[PDB]
Amino acid sequence: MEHVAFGSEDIENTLAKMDDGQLDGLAFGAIQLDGDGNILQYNAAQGDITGRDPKQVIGKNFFKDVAPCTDSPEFYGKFKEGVASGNLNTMFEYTFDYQMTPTKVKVHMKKALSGDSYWVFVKRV
Numbered sequence: 001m002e003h004v005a006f007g008s009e010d011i012e013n014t015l016a017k018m019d020d021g022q023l024d025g026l027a028f029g030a031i032q033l034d035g036d037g038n039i040l041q042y043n044a045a046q047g048d049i050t051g052r053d054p055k056q057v058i059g060k061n062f063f064k065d066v067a068p069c070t071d072s073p074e075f076y077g078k079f080k081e082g083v084a085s086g087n088l089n090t091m092f093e094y095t096f097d098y099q100m101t102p103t104k105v106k107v108h109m110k111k112a113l114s115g116d117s118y119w120v121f122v123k124r125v
């Protein structure tokens with residue numbers, strides 16, 4: 001288990017060290033996206049929240065294919081503004097309801113420390 005709190009101020013520094021197995025040790029869902037929204041990493045906690053099988057969604061586009069209910073100004077619009085700006089740090093509640101029981105969550109999106117990739121962190125509320 002990786003001991004990291006959801007919403008921590010320096011979360012991007014702490015998760016910069018994590019391979020897929022380490023990410024699977026977190027208490028919350030974690031997705032790493034490229035600037036187009038393609039999934040680079042998707043952890044076990046996230047799959048428990050959403051029902052998706054992690055290795056099956058890596059490589060898919062989060063907004064176009066996996067999570068169309070997030071293709072909205074309230075989620076994807078924030079993401080793409082942050083990619084365009086090169087800076088992103090926002091936390092909001094959302095409901096995931098595509099081919100699943102509607103599930104209310106808290107989402108924290110934050111630009112990764114290095115390069116140009118973006119974290120999406122999720123926990124139940």
Ligand SMILES: *C(=O)/C=C/c1ccc(O)cc1
Pocket residue numbers: 031046050052066067068069070095096097098
């Ligand atoms: C709405 O379509 C939400 C879907 C969803 C959210 C998060 C995931 O990791 C997978 C699917």
